[PDB]
mmCIF file of N, CA and C in Angstrom:
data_model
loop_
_atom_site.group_PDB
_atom_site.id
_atom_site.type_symbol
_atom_site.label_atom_id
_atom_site.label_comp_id
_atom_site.label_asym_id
_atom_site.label_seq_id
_atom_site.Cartn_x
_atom_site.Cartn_y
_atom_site.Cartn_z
ATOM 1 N N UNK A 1 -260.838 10.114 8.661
ATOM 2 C CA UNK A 1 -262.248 9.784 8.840
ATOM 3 C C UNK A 1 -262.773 8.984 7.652
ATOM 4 N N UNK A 2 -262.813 7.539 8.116
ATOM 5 C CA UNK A 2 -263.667 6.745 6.881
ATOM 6 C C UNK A 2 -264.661 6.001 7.109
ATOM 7 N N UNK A 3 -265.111 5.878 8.525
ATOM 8 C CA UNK A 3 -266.360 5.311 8.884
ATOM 9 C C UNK A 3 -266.177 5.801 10.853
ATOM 10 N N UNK A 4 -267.469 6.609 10.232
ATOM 11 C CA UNK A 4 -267.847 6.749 12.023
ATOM 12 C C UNK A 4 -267.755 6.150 13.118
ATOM 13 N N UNK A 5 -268.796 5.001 12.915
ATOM 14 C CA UNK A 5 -269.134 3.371 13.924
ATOM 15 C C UNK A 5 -267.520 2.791 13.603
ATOM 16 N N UNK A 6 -267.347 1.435 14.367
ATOM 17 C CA UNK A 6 -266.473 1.194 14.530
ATOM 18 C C UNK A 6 -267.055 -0.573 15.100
ATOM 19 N N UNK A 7 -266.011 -1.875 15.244
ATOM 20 C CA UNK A 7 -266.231 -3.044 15.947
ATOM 21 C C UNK A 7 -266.245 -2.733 17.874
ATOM 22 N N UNK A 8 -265.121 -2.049 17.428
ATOM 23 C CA UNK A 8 -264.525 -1.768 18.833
ATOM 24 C C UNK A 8 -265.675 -0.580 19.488
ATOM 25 N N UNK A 9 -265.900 0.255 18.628
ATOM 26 C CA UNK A 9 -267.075 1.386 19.118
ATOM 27 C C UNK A 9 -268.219 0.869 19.862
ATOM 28 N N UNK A 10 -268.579 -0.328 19.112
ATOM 29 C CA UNK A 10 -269.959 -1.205 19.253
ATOM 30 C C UNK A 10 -270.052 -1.843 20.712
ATOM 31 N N UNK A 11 -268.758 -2.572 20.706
ATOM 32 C CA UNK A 11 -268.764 -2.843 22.128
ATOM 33 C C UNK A 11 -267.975 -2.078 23.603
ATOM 34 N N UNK A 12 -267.411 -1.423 22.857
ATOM 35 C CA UNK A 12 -267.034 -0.150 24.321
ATOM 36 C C UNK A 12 -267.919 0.591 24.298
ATOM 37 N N UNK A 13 -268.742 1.062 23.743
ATOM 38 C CA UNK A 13 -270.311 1.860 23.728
ATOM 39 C C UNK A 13 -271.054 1.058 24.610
ATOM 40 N N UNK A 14 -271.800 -0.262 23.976
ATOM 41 C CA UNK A 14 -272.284 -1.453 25.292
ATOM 42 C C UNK A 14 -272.351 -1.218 26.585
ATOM 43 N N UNK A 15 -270.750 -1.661 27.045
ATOM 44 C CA UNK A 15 -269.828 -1.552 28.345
ATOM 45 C C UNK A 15 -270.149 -0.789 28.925
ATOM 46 N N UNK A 16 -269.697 0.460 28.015
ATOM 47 C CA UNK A 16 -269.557 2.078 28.631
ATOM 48 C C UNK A 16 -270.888 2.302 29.771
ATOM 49 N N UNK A 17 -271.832 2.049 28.862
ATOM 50 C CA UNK A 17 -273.013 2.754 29.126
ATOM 51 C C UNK A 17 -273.789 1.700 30.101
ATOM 52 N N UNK A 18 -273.362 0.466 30.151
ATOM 53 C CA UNK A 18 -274.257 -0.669 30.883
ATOM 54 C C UNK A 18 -273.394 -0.109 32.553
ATOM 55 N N UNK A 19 -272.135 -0.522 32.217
ATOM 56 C CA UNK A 19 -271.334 -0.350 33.666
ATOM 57 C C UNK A 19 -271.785 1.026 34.093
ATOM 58 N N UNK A 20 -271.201 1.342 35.034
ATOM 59 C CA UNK A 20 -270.951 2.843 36.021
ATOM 60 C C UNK A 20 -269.598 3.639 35.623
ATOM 61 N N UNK A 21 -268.837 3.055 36.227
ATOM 62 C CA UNK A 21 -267.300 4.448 35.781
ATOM 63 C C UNK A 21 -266.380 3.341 35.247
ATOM 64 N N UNK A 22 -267.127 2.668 34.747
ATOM 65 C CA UNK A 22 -266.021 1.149 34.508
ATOM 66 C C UNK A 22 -265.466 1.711 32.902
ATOM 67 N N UNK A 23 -264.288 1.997 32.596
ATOM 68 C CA UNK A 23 -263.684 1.748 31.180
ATOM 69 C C UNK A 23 -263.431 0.939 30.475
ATOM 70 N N UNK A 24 -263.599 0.408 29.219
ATOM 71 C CA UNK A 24 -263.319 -0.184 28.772
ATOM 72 C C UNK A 24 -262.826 0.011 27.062
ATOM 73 N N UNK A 25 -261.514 -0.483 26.704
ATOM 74 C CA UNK A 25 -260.594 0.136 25.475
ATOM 75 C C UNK A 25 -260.137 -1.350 24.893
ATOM 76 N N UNK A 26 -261.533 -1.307 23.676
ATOM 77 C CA UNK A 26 -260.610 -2.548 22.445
ATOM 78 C C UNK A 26 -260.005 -1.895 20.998
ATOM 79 N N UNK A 27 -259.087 -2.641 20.700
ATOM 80 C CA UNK A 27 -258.602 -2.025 19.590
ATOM 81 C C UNK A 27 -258.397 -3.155 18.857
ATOM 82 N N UNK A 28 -258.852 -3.212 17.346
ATOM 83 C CA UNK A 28 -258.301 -4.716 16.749
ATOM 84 C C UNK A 28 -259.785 -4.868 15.709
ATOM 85 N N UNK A 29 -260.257 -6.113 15.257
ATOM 86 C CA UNK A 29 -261.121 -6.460 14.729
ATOM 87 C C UNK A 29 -262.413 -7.825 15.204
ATOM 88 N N UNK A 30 -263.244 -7.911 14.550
ATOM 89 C CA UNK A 30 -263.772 -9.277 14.869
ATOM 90 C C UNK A 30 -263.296 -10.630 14.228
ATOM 91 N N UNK A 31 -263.104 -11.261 14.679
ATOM 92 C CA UNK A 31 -262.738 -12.400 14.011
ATOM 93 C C UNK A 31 -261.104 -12.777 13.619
ATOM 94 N N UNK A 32 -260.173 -11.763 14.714
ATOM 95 C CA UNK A 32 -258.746 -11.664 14.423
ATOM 96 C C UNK A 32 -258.128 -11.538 15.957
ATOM 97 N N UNK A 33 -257.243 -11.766 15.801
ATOM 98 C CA UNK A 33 -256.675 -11.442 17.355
ATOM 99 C C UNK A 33 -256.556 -10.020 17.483
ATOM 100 N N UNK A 34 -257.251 -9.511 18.394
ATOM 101 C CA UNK A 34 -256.869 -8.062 19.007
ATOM 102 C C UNK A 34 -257.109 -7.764 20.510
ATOM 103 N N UNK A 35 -256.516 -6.778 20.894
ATOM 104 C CA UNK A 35 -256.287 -6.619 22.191
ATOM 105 C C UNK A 35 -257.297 -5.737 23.094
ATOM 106 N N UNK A 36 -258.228 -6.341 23.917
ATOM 107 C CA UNK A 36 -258.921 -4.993 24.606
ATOM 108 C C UNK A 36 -259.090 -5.095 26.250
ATOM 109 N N UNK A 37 -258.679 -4.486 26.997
ATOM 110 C CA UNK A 37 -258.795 -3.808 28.027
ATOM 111 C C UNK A 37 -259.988 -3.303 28.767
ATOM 112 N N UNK A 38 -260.184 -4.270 29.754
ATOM 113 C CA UNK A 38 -261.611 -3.365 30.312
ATOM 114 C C UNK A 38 -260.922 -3.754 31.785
ATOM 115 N N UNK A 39 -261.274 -1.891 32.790
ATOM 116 C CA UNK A 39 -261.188 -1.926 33.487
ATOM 117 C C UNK A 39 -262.552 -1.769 34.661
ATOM 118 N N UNK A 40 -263.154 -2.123 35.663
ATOM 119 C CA UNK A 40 -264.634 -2.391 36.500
ATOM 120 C C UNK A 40 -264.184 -3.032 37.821
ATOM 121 N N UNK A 41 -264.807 -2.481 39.143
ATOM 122 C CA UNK A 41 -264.970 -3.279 40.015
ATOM 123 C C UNK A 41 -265.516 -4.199 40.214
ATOM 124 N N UNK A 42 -266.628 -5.088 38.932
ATOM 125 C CA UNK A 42 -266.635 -5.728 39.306
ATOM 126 C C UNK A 42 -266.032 -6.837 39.052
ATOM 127 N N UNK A 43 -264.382 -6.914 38.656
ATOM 128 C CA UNK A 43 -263.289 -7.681 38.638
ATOM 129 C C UNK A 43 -262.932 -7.837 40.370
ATOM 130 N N UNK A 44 -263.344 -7.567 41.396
ATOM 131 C CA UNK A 44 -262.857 -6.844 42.591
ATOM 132 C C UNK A 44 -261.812 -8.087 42.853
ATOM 133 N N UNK A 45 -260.834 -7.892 43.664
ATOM 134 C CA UNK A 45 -260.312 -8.685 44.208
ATOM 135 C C UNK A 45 -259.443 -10.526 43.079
ATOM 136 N N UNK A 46 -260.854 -10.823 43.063
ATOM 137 C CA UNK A 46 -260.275 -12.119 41.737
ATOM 138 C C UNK A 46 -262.310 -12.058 41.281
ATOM 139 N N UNK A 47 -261.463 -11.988 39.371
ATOM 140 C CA UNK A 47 -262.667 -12.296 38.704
ATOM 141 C C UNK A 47 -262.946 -13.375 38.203
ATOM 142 N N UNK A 48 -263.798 -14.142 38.547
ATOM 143 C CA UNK A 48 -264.554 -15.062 38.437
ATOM 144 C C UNK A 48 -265.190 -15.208 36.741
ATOM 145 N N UNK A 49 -265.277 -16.566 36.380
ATOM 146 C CA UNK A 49 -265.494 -16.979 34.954
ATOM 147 C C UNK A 49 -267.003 -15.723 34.843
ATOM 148 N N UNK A 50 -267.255 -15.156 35.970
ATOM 149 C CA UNK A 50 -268.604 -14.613 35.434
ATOM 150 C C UNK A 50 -268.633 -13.055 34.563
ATOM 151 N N UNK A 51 -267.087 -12.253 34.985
ATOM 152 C CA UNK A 51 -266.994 -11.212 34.916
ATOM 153 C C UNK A 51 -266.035 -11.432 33.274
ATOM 154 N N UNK A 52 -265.274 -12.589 33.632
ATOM 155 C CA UNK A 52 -264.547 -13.231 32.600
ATOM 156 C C UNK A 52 -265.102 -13.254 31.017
ATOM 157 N N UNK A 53 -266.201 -14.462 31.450
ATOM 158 C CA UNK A 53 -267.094 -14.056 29.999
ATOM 159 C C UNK A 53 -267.708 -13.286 29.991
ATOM 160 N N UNK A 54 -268.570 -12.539 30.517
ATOM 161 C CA UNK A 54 -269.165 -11.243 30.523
ATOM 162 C C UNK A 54 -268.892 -10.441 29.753
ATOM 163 N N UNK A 55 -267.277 -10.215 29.900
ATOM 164 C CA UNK A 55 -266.449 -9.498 28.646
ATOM 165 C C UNK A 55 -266.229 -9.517 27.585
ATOM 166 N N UNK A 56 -265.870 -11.198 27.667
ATOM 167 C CA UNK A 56 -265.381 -12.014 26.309
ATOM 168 C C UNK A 56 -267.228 -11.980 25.628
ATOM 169 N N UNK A 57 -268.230 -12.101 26.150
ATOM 170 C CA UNK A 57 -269.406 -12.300 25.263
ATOM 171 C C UNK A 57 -269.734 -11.053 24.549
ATOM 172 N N UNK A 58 -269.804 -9.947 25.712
ATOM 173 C CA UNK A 58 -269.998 -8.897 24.783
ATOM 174 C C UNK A 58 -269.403 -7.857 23.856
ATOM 175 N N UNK A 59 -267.777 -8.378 23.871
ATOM 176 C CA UNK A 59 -266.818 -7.827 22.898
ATOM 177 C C UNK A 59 -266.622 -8.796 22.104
ATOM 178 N N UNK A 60 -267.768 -9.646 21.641
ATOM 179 C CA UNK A 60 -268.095 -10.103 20.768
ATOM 180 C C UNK A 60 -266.845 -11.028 20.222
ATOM 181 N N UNK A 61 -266.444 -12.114 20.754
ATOM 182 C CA UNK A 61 -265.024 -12.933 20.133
ATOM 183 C C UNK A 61 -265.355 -13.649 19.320
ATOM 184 N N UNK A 62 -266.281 -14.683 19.687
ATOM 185 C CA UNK A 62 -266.828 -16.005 19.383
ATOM 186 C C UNK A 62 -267.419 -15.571 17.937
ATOM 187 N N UNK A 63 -268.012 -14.407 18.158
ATOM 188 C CA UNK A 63 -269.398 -13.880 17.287
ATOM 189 C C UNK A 63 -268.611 -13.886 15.589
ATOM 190 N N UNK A 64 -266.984 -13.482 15.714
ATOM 191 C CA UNK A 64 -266.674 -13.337 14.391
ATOM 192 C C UNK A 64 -265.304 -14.658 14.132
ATOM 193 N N UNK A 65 -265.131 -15.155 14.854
ATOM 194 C CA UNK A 65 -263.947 -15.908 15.082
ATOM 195 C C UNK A 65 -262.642 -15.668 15.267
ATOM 196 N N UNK A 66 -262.703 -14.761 16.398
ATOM 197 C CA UNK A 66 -261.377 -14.150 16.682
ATOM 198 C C UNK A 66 -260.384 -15.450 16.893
ATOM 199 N N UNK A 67 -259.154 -15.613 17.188
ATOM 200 C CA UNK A 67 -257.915 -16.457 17.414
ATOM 201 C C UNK A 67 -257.586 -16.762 18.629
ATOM 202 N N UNK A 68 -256.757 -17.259 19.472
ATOM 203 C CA UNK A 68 -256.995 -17.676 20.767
ATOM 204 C C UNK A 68 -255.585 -16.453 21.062
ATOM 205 N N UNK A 69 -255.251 -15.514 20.551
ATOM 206 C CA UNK A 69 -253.966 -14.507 20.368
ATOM 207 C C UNK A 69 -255.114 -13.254 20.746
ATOM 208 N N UNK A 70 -256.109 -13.558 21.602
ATOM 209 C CA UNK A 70 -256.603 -12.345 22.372
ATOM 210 C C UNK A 70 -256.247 -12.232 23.671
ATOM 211 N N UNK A 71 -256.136 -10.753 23.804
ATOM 212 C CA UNK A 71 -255.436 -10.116 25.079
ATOM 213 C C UNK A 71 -256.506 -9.184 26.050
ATOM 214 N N UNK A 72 -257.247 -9.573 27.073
ATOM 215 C CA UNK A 72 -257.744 -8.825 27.898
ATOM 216 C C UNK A 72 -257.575 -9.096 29.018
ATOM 217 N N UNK A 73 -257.500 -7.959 30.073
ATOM 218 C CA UNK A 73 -257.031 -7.955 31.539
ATOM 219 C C UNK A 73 -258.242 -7.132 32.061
ATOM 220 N N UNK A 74 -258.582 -7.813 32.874
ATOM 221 C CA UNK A 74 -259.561 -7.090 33.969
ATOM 222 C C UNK A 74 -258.876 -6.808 35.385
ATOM 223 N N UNK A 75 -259.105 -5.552 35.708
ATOM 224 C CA UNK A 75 -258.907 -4.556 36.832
ATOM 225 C C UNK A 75 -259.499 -3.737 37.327
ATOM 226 N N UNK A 76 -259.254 -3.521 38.274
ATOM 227 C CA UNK A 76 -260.292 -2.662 39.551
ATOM 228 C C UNK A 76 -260.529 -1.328 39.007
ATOM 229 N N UNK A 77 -261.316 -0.719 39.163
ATOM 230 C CA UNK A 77 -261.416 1.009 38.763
ATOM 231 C C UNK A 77 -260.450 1.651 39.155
ATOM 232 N N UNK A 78 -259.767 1.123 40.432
ATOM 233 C CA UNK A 78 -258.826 1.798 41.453
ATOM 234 C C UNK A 78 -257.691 1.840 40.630
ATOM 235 N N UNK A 79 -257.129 0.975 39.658
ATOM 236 C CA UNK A 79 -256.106 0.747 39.218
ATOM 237 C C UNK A 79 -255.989 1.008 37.905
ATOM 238 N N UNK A 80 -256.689 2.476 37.904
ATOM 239 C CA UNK A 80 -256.644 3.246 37.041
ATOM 240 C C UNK A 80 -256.260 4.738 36.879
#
């Protein structure tokens, strides 16, 4: 235990609480390549640049200058 809050806290907290049963798991930093995972229906079927950045804006990439060595996959709730 060396700091409560967290980058990743900040925006899976966001997510968490904006979506419904949608999960979402980043691990890594701002401004570095790291990997995060959000799963939501509303990826349904094929996600669209809307659900796309949606993600990418509010797990904050741009905001610190992450690397183009980021990893996120969007998937259905079901496929969880």
């Amino acid at each position: 235990m060396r700091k409560r809050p967290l980058d990743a806290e900040t925006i899976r907290k966001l997510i968490e609480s904006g979506l419904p049963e949608a999960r979402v798991d980043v691990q890594g930093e701002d401004g570095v390549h790291f990997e995060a995972t959000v799963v939501s229906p509303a990826f349904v079927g094929k996600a669209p640049l809307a659900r796309h950045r949606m993600v990418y804006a509010t797990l904050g990439e741009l905001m610190g200058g992450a690397i183009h060595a980021l990893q996120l996959k969007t998937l259905t709730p079901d496929e969880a």
